Write a protein that binds this ligand. Structure first.
Ligand SMILES: Cc1cc(-c2cccn3ccnc23)ccc1-c1c(C)c(=O)[nH]c(=O)n1C
Lengths: 57, 282, 339, 238
């Protein structure tokens, strides 16, 4: 009596996961590039910071 | 040109001793997973004693061999004390290593609660104090020489007294400790083989018993063959007909034990790994 | 009956896969091709913290980027001052099998949990001064594997009983239960706005959860083995995963599919931890082979390697200001990196 | 200025006070042996824990001859594919408890125990961990073998050709029929044990009962043997 319930619950979950709207990958990849470009000046691990203001020296 | 060949051999021996004991000393400093164990507190002491043998003892006698006389004059009376101290320390370190291994293997639970890093220090201090006591106090008192170049003859009393404390007592302890380790190692092999035989009979060794004899034979025969001819003649000569050349050969055999000590005692899985890391990062 | 529902599920899966294929137009590598490579990353151990007796399983930075807590399988929860290497607290635990810890964003609480199936909350700043257990959250039927504070009163925990839960610390009762995973849930990662969170499980699937709604929104696949680590991109629209099959992947929430794969031919050990940087350009990941590999999140080129741990690297964190990187290991040492 | 000096002094005092406490705990940690206890709910595992003492993990502390032991039960809402099994890769031993009288009870319970033992034995995280094997419920097995309708050959066909090994030390009053079954089951476990034995871990079978005062001494002696063999192996003598 539980197999039918689990199958119907799985179908119900899969129905909800298929009703979303998906954007193109090209636009999605273009937004991660935009984020890194605008914050590359405040990434101390990427751009080395002089030891004057480094608190670990 | 046999002189050149002898000089090359002696230089190779000194360089081998220096390199081996420096590599043993270098690895323990670099890696703190070797310094953690109290059992390695005794290997580094042995390496230090072998290093002092290589530095303060071997080169000057090697030079005196090549030249044919003693070019230092007033250093003979201090060189003898350094020789005695640095050889006695090595032998006592070997004895302490054997006792440590025996106590670890025979009483594994009392070893873990009592072998604190403050007992290894006491043992090492006792060994080096015994080394210092018999080497400098008697020598800088004219007690080693018989009352009747650097070719002195030891007193009939001092030669016997120092040969016992420095060789005979340490070599008996090593024999008793390494034979109880042999008995333990053979009981364990019999129990494992019994279970394997039971499994085989359900389905219906020799190398292990050879491995234990190989290691013990390598440990003991090297030490005995290196130091026994020297200490046999060290007691016969004061009583007095063998010349000094054969005695020099046996003296040099005694010091060659310090070259193989890194191979015998600091050549396990992790010491070898540290040596590979220090040599080419392999 | 059963055949009809099986066919319906097959049709739904085929529709989802067809939609994902249709939305796939160009790859991340193709777009990120003219970008100047970062180059090489030089990072040196700036600190080394000692005091734990056994393997270290977790660590967590504070929001001030100075304090951090770490967990060891010796029953200790030690709080460090990363600047001065001093120890601020040392909290003994009732159970010796802790596998996760967390730092409250306010800084007044630390969490804990493990094989005892209990999440323990500790009061750090109190008028007495001592550190005592405030609450104990029971209700999971499997080991606690991760826990992340939302505020001083809410916390999300993941468990090996294939279930994540949201709790109310004041009342000690569950508020929402997140079901749908078939294998043990291993990791959690809260969104920057604490509105969503992702979890990785042993069924090689990740899921995106709605905290206020309680339902699963998106399900991501692609890994072949258990997922051990998961992390959000700083933007909040992407996340990264680490697995036992010696690979890392980047997924996009809006595109609803994988974008990049971070792997190498000479890597066969699994990933234990994963993290990002302040800009999101670098992808730091811990490995079973005792070191940490710094990646390039846009080009999949290994920018550097962090080495110096004697044993397996188990945990890995990056400060909120981007200043430093801390790693713990099974050799019981915390090493802070910078460069 | 002065405020920074005062703060640093207070922080150093607190750090020193903490480090003083961390020094005794290091001494206590090194004196304790961790033991992982496995088995099934059908086996007499629960009674053994009660004897040692006299819902997440269950932990128990007991001490023998000034040696501290610390044992863990993982029978807390678990399943197969043990992911938590890597937390115990540096324990002294694993205590595997089996109900020997469950051969007829139903696949077979004994076959399930054998499969679990083979799974644990070949685990990658347990390649240096020895197993102390308890073959529990021996009185029930003796009663079943003596009188009843349960024939081992019906469930295990290999029992029709088994022969008692010569290294058998049966109790003086036991029926020789009972001893054959005991050693057949023990050899069935030992075949798995020695078919993949690496030389770094071993198995220590025992014929036990759920209510025994000798189980603690069995664990103590087997742990002593494990530590001794590890010492012997680290010196290239074994
Ligand atoms: C004969 C001797 C014996 C010992 C000794 C005595 C007791 C314990 N020992 C342990 C190691 N060496 C010793 C030391 C140095 C000498 C010696 C040598 C080699 C030489 O060429 N010229 C000398 O005049 N002497 C004195």
């Amino acid at each position: 009596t539980a197999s039918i319930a689990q199958a119907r619950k799985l179908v119900e979950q899969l129905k909800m996961e298929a009703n979303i709207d998906r954007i193109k990958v090209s636009k999605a990849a273009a937004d991660l590039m935009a984020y890194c470009e605008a914050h590359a000046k405040e990434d101390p691990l990427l751009t080395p910071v002089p030891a004057s203001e480094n608190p670990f020296r | 040109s046999v002189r050149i060949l002898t000089a090359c051999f002696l230089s190779l021996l000194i360089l081998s001793t220096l390199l081996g004991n420096t590599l043993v000393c270098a690895a323990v400093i670099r890696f703190r997973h070797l310094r953690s164990k109290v059992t390695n507190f005794f290997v580094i002491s042995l390496a230090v004693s072998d290093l002092l043998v290589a530095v303060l003892v071997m080169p000057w006698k090697a030079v005196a061999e090549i030249a044919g006389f003693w070019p230092f004059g007033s250093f003979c009376n201090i060189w003898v004390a350094f020789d005695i101290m640095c050889s006695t320390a090595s032998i006592l370190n070997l004895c302490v290593i054997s006792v440590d291994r025996y106590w670890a293997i025979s009483s594994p639970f009392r070893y873990e609660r009592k072998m604190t890093p403050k007992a290894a220090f006491i043992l090492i201090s006792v060994a080096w104090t015994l080394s210092v006591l018999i080497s400098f106090i008697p020598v800088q008192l004219s007690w080693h020489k018989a009352k009747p170049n650097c070719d002195s003859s030891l007193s009939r009393t001092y030669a016997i007294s120092s040969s016992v404390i420095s060789f005979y007592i340490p070599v008996a302890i090593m024999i008793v400790t390494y034979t109880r380790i042999y008995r333990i190692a053979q009981k364990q092999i019999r129990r494992i083989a019994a279970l394997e035989r039971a499994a085989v009979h359900a389905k219906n060794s020799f190398k292990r018993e050879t491995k234990v004899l190989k290691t013990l034979s390598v440990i003991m025969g090297v030490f005995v063959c290196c130091w026994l001819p020297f200490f046999i003649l060290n007691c016969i000569l004061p009583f007095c007909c063998i010349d000094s050349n054969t005695f020099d050969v046996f003296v040099w055999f005694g010091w060659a034990n310090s070259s193989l000590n890194p191979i015998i005692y600091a050549f396990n899985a992790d010491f070898r790994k540290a040596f590979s890391t220090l040599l080419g990062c392999y | 009956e059963l055949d009809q529902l099986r066919q319906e599920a097959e049709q739904l899966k085929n529709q989802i896969r067809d939609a994902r294929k249709a939305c796939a137009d160009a790859t991340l590598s193709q777009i990120t091709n003219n970008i100047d490579p970062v180059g090489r990353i030089q990072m040196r151990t700036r600190r080394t913290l000692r005091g734990h007796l056994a393997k270290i399983y977790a660590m967590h930075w504070g929001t001030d980027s100075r304090l951090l807590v770490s967990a060891s399988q010796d029953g200790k929860l030690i709080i460090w001052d990363s600047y001065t290497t001093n120890k601020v607290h040392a909290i003994p635990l009732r159970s010796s099998w802790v596998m996760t810890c967390a730092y409250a964003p306010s800084g007044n609480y630390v969490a804990c949990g493990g094989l005892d199936n209990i999440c323990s909350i500790y009061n750090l700043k109190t008028r007495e001064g001592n550190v005592r257990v405030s609450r104990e959250l029971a209700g999971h039927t499997g080991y606690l594997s991760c826990c992340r504070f939302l505020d001083d009163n809410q916390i999300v925990t993941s468990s090996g009983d294939t279930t994540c839960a949201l709790w109310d610390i004041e009342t000690g009762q569950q508020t929402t239960t997140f079901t749908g995973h078939t294998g043990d849930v291993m990791s959690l990662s809260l969104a920057p706005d604490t509105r969503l969170f992702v979890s990785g499980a042993c069924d090689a699937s990740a899921k995106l959860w709605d905290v206020r709604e309680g339902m699963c929104r998106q399900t991501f696949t692609g890994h072949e083995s258990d997922i051990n680590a998961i992390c959000f991109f700083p933007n909040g629209n992407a996340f990264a995963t680490g697995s036992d099959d010696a690979t890392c992947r980047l997924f996009d929430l809006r595109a609803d599919q994988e974008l990049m794969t971070y792997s190498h031919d000479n890597i066969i050990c699994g990933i234990t931890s994963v993290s990002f940087s302040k800009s999101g350009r670098l992808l730091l990941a811990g490995y079973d082979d005792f070191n940490c590999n710094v990646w390039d999140a846009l080009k999949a080129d290994r920018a550097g390697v962090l080495a110096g741990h004697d044993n397996r690297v188990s945990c890995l964190g990056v400060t909120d200001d981007g200043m430093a990187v801390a790693t713990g290991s099974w050799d019981s040492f915390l090493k802070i990196w910078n460069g | 200025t002065e405020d920074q000096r005062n703060e640093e002094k207070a922080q150093r005092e607190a750090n020193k006070k903490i480090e003083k406490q961390l020094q005794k705990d290091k001494q206590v940690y090194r004196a304790t042996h961790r033991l992982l206890l496995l088995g099934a709910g059908e086996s007499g595992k629960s009674t053994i824990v009660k004897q040692m003492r006299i819902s997440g993990i269950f932990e128990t502390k007991f001490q023998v001859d000034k040696v501290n032991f610390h044992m863990f039960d993982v029978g807390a809402q678990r399943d197969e594919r043990r992911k938590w099994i890597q937390c115990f890769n540096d324990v002294t031993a694993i205590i595997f408890v089996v109900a020997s009288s469950s051969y007829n009870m139903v696949t077979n319970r004994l076959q399930e125990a054998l499969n679990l033992f083979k799974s644990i034995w070949n685990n990658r995280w347990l390649r240096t961990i020895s197993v102390i094997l308890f073959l529990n419920k021996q009185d029930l097995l003796a009663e079943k073998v003596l009188a009843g309708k349960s024939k081992i050959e019906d469930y295990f066909p290999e029992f029709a050709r088994y022969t008692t090994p010569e290294d058998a030390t049966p109790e003086p009053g036991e029926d020789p029929r009972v001893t054959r079954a005991k050693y057949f089951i023990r050899d069935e476990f030992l075949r798995i044990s020695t078919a993949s034995g690496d030389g770094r871990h071993y198995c220590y079978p025992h014929f036990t009962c759920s209510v025994d005062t000798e189980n603690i001494r069995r664990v103590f002696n087997d742990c002593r043997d494990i530590i001794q063999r590890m010492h012997l192996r680290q010196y290239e003598l074994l």
